[PDB]
Amino acid sequence: IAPCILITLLAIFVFYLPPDAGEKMGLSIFALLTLTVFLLLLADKVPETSLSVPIIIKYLMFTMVLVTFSVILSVVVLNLHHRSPHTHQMPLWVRQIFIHKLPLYLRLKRPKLPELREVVSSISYIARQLQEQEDHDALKEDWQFVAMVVDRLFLWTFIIFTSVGTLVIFLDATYHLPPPDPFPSR
Amino acid sequence: SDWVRMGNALDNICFWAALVLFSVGSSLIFLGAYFNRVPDLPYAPCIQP
Amino acid sequence: RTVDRLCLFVVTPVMVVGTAWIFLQGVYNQPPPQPFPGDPYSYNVQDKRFI
Amino acid sequence: YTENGEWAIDFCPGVIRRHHGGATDGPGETDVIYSLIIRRKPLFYVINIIVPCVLISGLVLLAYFLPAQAGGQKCTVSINVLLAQTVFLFLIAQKIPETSLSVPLLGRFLIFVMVVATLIVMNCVIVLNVSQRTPTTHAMSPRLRHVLLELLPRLL
Amino acid sequence: ISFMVNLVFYLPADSGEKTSVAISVLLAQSVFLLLISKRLPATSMAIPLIGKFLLFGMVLVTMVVVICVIVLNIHFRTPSTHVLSEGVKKLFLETLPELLHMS
Amino acid sequence: HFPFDEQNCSMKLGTWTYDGSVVAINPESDQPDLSNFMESGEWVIKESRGWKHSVTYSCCPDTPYLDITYHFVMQRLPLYFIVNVIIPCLLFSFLTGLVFYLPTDSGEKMTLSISVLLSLTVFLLVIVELIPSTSSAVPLIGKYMLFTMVFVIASIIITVIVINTHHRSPSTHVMPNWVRKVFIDTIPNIMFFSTMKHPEVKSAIEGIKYIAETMKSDQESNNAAAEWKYVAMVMDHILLGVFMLVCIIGTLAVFAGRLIELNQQG
Amino acid sequence: HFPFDEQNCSMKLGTWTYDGSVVAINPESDQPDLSNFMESGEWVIKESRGWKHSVTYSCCPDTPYLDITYHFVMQRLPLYFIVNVIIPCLLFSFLTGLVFYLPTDSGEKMTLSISVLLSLTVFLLVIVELIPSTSSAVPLIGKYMLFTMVFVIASIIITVIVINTHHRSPSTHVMPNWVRKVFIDTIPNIMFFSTMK
Ligand SMILES: *[C@@H]1O[C@H](CO)[C@@H](O[C@@H]2O[C@H](CO)[C@@H](O[C@@H]3O[C@H](CO[C@H]4O[C@H](CO)[C@@H](O)[C@H](O)[C@@H]4O)[C@@H](O)[C@H](O[C@H]4O[C@H](CO)[C@@H](O)[C@H](O)[C@@H]4O)[C@@H]3O)[C@H](O)[C@H]2NC(C)=O)[C@H](O)[C@H]1NC(C)=O
Ligand SMILES: *[C@@H]1O[C@H](CO)[C@@H](O[C@@H]2O[C@H](CO)[C@@H](O[C@@H]3O[C@H](CO[C@H]4O[C@H](CO)[C@@H](O)[C@H](O)[C@@H]4O)[C@@H](O)[C@H](O[C@H]4O[C@H](CO)[C@@H](O)[C@H](O)[C@@H]4O)[C@@H]3O)[C@H](O)[C@H]2NC(C)=O)[C@H](O)[C@H]1NC(C)=O
Ligand SMILES: *[C@@H]1O[C@H](CO)[C@@H](O[C@@H]2O[C@H](CO)[C@@H](O[C@@H]3O[C@H](CO[C@H]4O[C@H](CO)[C@@H](O)[C@H](O)[C@@H]4O)[C@@H](O)[C@H](O[C@H]4O[C@H](CO)[C@@H](O)[C@H](O)[C@@H]4O)[C@@H]3O)[C@H](O)[C@H]2NC(C)=O)[C@H](O)[C@H]1NC(C)=O
Ligand SMILES: *[C@@H]1O[C@H](CO)[C@@H](O[C@@H]2O[C@H](CO)[C@@H](O[C@@H]3O[C@H](CO[C@H]4O[C@H](CO)[C@@H](O)[C@H](O)[C@@H]4O)[C@@H](O)[C@H](O[C@H]4O[C@H](CO)[C@@H](O)[C@H](O)[C@@H]4O)[C@@H]3O)[C@H](O)[C@H]2NC(C)=O)[C@H](O)[C@H]1NC(C)=O
Ligand SMILES: CCCCCCCC/C=C/CCCCCCCC(=O)O[C@@H](COC(=O)CCCCCCCCCCCCCCC)COP(=O)([O-])OCC[N+](C)(C)C
Ligand SMILES: CC(C)CCC[C@@H](C)[C@H]1CC[C@H]2[C@@H]3CC=C4C[C@@H](O)CC[C@]4(C)[C@H]3CC[C@]12C
Ligand SMILES: CC(C)CCC[C@@H](C)[C@H]1CC[C@H]2[C@@H]3CC=C4C[C@@H](O)CC[C@]4(C)[C@H]3CC[C@]12C
Ligand SMILES: CC(C)CCC[C@@H](C)[C@H]1CC[C@H]2[C@@H]3CC=C4C[C@@H](O)CC[C@]4(C)[C@H]3CC[C@]12C
Numbered sequence A: 001i002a003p004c005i006l007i008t009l010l011a012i013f014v015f016y017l018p019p020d021a022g023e024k025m026g027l028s029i030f031a032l033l034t035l036t037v038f039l040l041l042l043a044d045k046v047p048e049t050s051l052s053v054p055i056i057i058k059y060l061m062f063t064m065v066l067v068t069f070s071v072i073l074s075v076v077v078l079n080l081h082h083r084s085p086h087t088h089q090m091p092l093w094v095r096q097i098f099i100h101k102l103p104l105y106l107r108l109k110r111p112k113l114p115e116l117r118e119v120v121s122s123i124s125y126i127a128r129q130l131q132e133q134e135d136h137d138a139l140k141e142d143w144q145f146v147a148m149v150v151d152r153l154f155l156w157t158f159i160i161f162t163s164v165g166t167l168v169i170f171l172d173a174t175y176h177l178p179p180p181d182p183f184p185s186r
Numbered sequence B: 001s002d003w004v005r006m007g008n009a010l011d012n013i014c015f016w017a018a019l020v021l022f023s024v025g026s027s028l029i030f031l032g033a034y035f036n037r038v039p040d041l042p043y044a045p046c047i048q049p
Numbered sequence C: 001r002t003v004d005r006l007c008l009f010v011v012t013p014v015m016v017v018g019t020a021w022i023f024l025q026g027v028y029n030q031p032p033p034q035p036f037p038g039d040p041y042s043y044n045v046q047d048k049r050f051i
Numbered sequence D: 001y002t003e004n005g006e007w008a009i010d011f012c013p014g015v016i017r018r019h020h021g022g023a024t025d026g027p028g029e030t031d032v033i034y035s036l037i038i039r040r041k042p043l044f045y046v047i048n049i050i051v052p053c054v055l056i057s058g059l060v061l062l063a064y065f066l067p068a069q070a071g072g073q074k075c076t077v078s079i080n081v082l083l084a085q086t087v088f089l090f091l092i093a094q095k096i097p098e099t100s101l102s103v104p105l106l107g108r109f110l111i112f113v114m115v116v117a118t119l120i121v122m123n124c125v126i127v128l129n130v131s132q133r134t135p136t137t138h139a140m141s142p143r144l145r146h147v148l149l150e151l152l153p154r155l156l
Numbered sequence E: 001i002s003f004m005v006n007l008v009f010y011l012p013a014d015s016g017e018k019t020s021v022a023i024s025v026l027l028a029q030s031v032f033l034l035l036i037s038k039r040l041p042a043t044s045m046a047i048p049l050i051g052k053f054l055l056f057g058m059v060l061v062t063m064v065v066v067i068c069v070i071v072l073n074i075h076f077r078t079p080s081t082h083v084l085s086e087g088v089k090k091l092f093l094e095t096l097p098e099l100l101h102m103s
Numbered sequence F: 001h002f003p004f005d006e007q008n009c010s011m012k013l014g015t016w017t018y019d020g021s022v023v024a025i026n027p028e029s030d031q032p033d034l035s036n037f038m039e040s041g042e043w044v045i046k047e048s049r050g051w052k053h054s055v056t057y058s059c060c061p062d063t064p065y066l067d068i069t070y071h072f073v074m075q076r077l078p079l080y081f082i083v084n085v086i087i088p089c090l091l092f093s094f095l096t097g098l099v100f101y102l103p104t105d106s107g108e109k110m111t112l113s114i115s116v117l118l119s120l121t122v123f124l125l126v127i128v129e130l131i132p133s134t135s136s137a138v139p140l141i142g143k144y145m146l147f148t149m150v151f152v153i154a155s156i157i158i159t160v161i162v163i164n165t166h167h168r169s170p171s172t173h174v175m176p177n178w179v180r181k182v183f184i185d186t187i188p189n190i191m192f193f194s195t196m197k198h199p200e201v202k203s204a205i206e207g208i209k210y211i212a213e214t215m216k217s218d219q220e221s222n223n224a225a226a227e228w229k230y231v232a233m234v235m236d237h238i239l240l241g242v243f244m245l246v247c248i249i250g251t252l253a254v255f256a257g258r259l260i261e262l263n264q265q266g
Numbered sequence G: 001h002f003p004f005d006e007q008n009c010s011m012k013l014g015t016w017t018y019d020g021s022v023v024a025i026n027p028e029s030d031q032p033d034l035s036n037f038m039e040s041g042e043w044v045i046k047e048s049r050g051w052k053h054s055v056t057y058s059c060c061p062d063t064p065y066l067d068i069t070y071h072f073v074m075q076r077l078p079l080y081f082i083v084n085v086i087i088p089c090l091l092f093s094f095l096t097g098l099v100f101y102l103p104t105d106s107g108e109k110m111t112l113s114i115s116v117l118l119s120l121t122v123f124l125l126v127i128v129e130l131i132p133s134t135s136s137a138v139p140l141i142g143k144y145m146l147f148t149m150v151f152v153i154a155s156i157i158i159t160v161i162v163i164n165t166h167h168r169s170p171s172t173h174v175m176p177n178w179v180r181k182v183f184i185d186t187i188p189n190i191m192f193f194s195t196m197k
């Protein structure tokens, strides 16, 4: 139980890892691998019958599904982050929802004479290239900000979904007490 | 870029070397089994077909 | 980098001290000098209790 | 007769032997020996162990096609194939016999692919070392340049 | 292997191999836990000493992974996504480095 | 059909040393007595029945040999194997196709793919620990596991091809016409995505000109590389769709036959 | 010396309730009869010999106690442990040193070293299921595995130090004179010198 809780905490903390570090996938998928090792651990202990599923098995599969969804949504965030600005045009609804509406609600504050003729041509070309670079960087920053907002949304969603599921399973296990009477009336 | 091209050439020749090694060794190891059939003995089968 | 250095000097001593305490509980674990607490007799061949 | 799930009985001759009939041996002895010649049906090992092991061990050849840069993950692939081979070693240790008269084919194949993977890991390390040389640390060796870039394509 | 997790603090954030090291240490600890689980009975009278160390090490390695995530998050901030206040600059670039005898 | 398998298992009973002419055996009832049968958590007995058989040989026409064979038709309860085997395999198979949505510039494609393979390999230990190991036939679990393994291997190989295409240098490699026509012209038509007078003065003049030409050449090289990146991005989209389709259809083609058979037969 | 160990086990035989003054025992032959001995796939019997022994105690000088002890000198066949245990350890030991030829800019040094460590950790399952779980002495395989584990760990430590040194910049550190003199001046003079200063 305790290693599963720790793995779940790390799966939550994946979403705080910046995309530029190039480390989300390794963390999430090695968490999945550790859960696989723990499934191997439980194989020698759990009963073999098929009338019902043990609650510890339910918790293990819930954790596996949580880590799988963390992997999937980390892939989504990385796809948004590394999106090439010139091959993608950001739709206007994406701009609205993920740059104007959601960031306020998630508390994400975005801050804010041959020689002379050849000289003029070269300088103007360099300035135009740098202006194009600036526009490209602005679109790239817009995509990266969308990725960051989506990452924060997924972080909060995972906190809520982990808390609710863990509380439900743990309270179901905790309040399963033995019978007060050896022969209860049914 | 010259260094990268040198590395690419090394990786190209070494691919074929490794492929030949892997294929030949695996083929020999499994052909050892392919020639390990039950010998043709001078007896009838234990179970009639 | 500063946060990393502070976390090094905070986390490594905790790990070392916790490991040392946990394993020192076991290193100095020996059975009692007598087989039965409260009984001073050693139940050894040397210390025969002649009638 | 229902055939064993793993073993097929091909032959089963019987022989009546007599020995120790000599004067020095004394009273003669006899017995009956039946020789069950049984063939294993290897389907379980083929589906569960050998085919996955062969594919995972063939994956190291893909490392030769990845770029020799920071984001290539050429060493990632090779060494993780070695790790998977170690997992397969643990798997195979539960099945093989534990005698030392000869090495079983499964173990021989696993050790061979592990050696090949180690050699490919060394090869990838060398290729990376050659590829990411910069003038700030290394001087351009002309012998290797001529051997690889000029002589090799013309020889090929 | 458990003590090996402490080297991540000395790894630079530009290497991009910090959380990988820490989570791999966690995986190795899980393998050791699997090894120990076969060798003792599942009694509740006490936690074994080796079990106590393994739980303590797993918790510490998890905390180290969280710390590495936070350190990388701080490292990869830029003016276009975060604002670097003067208080943070004063605290983390002048006072703490000289307290800690950093270069 | 394991774990959805049905097993007919018999128990032949007879007098070992007495023949039917001195000792006759008859079943007490047409079925075995299951009144005091304890419920099984792994099997359900659909049918049970006891048949008497008499066999006479031409050598001994006056001495028949009698037996009573009780047979039980048993159906396995598959919930344990569904929960512990099939669901993790389904999760790994679903994760296999996600690499084709992961950009190459992330530098984590091989991390994801190879680590999914490692997780599947570690889960193979669980597979061997749980299901029985026999060579009479390939179980349904075995077929699904092998399908997942081949799926992961194919994903790794195609991912390596995609990465190689992404990193094609425009100097060493030149674009074939067929690649341009297939991937830049034809395929994107069906893609509904966001896709697409002192010496020193003269030296200074030549320096500014050289800088301008250097930026120009860099721009052309970057555009040529971006064409390859676009090509690899088109292959990634198609491969994501194809692999998600193959996952679903492989799962169905593996299980739905036996599932439909059991549903139709109650 | 496991798995190259030689073991001398015996079988002590004697009359439980009869002393030598009522029942006398003598071996049939100097050596055990091995004519019908089935071949062993794990051990070879180098030597075998049966010895009679007589013990007399001062309490009862006239009642000797007899036994016949057959001893067998047995040499282990080590091919199984060579193939399954030693060779993978040798491969991991060889892979340990290859990280120091990897460039730091590859960003794969930690991947290689940590994956070798993980392979050794997984291999510990094989070794502990194979190695004798006794504390009389350290088996030789155990010594070799501890060697490999300790030195891959040392390689990981030193690789972290090397990466840290590689990533240094004047904005964080200043090169001391002794580091420059030791590493840039003296050592390259006694090296291949293909790498320019
Ligand atoms: C651990 O396991 C044991 C064994 O499985 C359980 O013991 C059973 O407990 C139940 C509930 O207490 C018992 O069921 C009750 O039996 C009473 C007596 O029945 C006997 O006597 C009558 C005649 O008087 C016979 O007809 C009958 O065949 C028996 O021989 C009944 O009087 C009870 O009925 C009353 O309660 C039920 C439920 O509320 C109502 O529906 C009825 O209308 C009526 O009011 C009832 O049937 C059962 O017999 C026990 N089995 C035994 C003793 O072998 C333990 O309960 C279980 N412990 C747990 C789970 O904590
Ligand atoms: C390994 O395991 C064995 C048990 O398997 C332990 O042996 C036990 O040791 C304890 C302590 O030495 C014994 O407990 C003592 O029993 C004495 C006799 O009690 C009997 O007689 C009285 C009447 O005279 C009856 O009432 C009673 O029911 C018994 O039949 C007591 O006199 C001792 O009193 C001590 O404890 C009390 C309470 O704390 C004090 O007030 C006294 O002053 C005094 O200190 C005591 O209770 C126990 O009987 C042993 N079990 C056996 C022999 O089976 C070994 O100690 C243990 N070894 C180690 C190293 O752990
Ligand atoms: C699992 O495996 C068991 C075998 O281990 C199968 O059991 C068989 O079940 C069928 C019925 O479904 C049995 O067939 C019936 O046998 C009866 C007795 O036959 C014996 O006695 C007669 C005496 O005259 C001999 O002639 C005969 O050789 C046998 O020694 C017959 O009386 C039944 O006849 C009925 O069917 C026939 C057509 O088949 C009609 O013409 C008749 O009028 C009548 O309706 C019938 O033949 C069979 O003998 C069983 N075998 C054994 C070895 O027990 C299970 O069916 C199988 N379960 C599955 C797969 O679902
Ligand atoms: C594995 O372990 C076993 C048991 O420890 C070893 O067996 C011992 O082997 C040695 C030989 O190396 C034996 O020693 C020999 O015993 C003989 C016994 O003779 C009988 O008669 C005398 C009276 O004359 C009695 O006292 C005795 O009990 C017997 O009834 C001796 O005759 C041998 O003599 C040799 O040594 C003497 C010097 O001591 C010389 O003068 C002789 O010429 C001759 O060389 C000898 O002493 C010993 O008895 C065995 N012990 C047991 C318990 O069986 C194995 O050797 C060992 N295997 C290894 C490690 O290889
Ligand atoms: C051992 C574990 C704790 C280690 C802490 C080490 C700290 C070292 C020192 C850090 C110094 C940082 C200085 C620069 C920033 C100053 C301003 C500031 O605080 O805001 C910045 C945060 O900066 C932080 O680091 C906030 C603290 C950590 C947040 C992560 C969750 C809580 C801790 C881990 C969980 C503990 C319990 C579970 C694990 C046991 C900017 O914040 P934001 O990104 O705009 O919004 C974050 C919102 N969120 C938190 C919802 C995502
Ligand atoms: C946690 C979620 C997200 C993923 C894992 C799903 C698990 C918990 C599901 C899959 C199959 C399910 C079981 C299917 C059928 C039965 C039989 C009956 O007694 C109701 C509960 C029980 C025993 C279910 C319990 C929950 C279960 C085990
Ligand atoms: C794997 C590659 C690299 C090398 C292959 C080398 C070949 C020649 C080796 C590998 C395994 C070897 C076999 C292993 C064991 C035996 C049993 C023994 O009683 C006779 C020799 C025999 C049958 C060997 C013959 C030679 C052999 C087939
Ligand atoms: C390292 C690579 C090249 C080879 C990997 C396979 C290894 C395990 C193979 C290669 C050659 C093989 C040996 C070849 C021949 C013999 C003689 C035979 O009487 C017993 C087995 C023995 C001693 C083999 C043992 C296994 C062996 C050592």
Ligand SMILES: CC(C)CCC[C@@H](C)[C@H]1CC[C@H]2[C@@H]3CC=C4C[C@@H](O)CC[C@]4(C)[C@H]3CC[C@]12C
Pocket: G146, G150, G153, G154
């Ligand atoms: C950090 C790197 C360099 C690895 C260091 C390994 C050291 C700490 C290890 C390797 C071998 C170990 C020794 C191996 C065996 C024994 C005998 C026994 O009495 C326990 C302690 C003792 C004496 C160990 C002490 C710790 C030890 C010396």
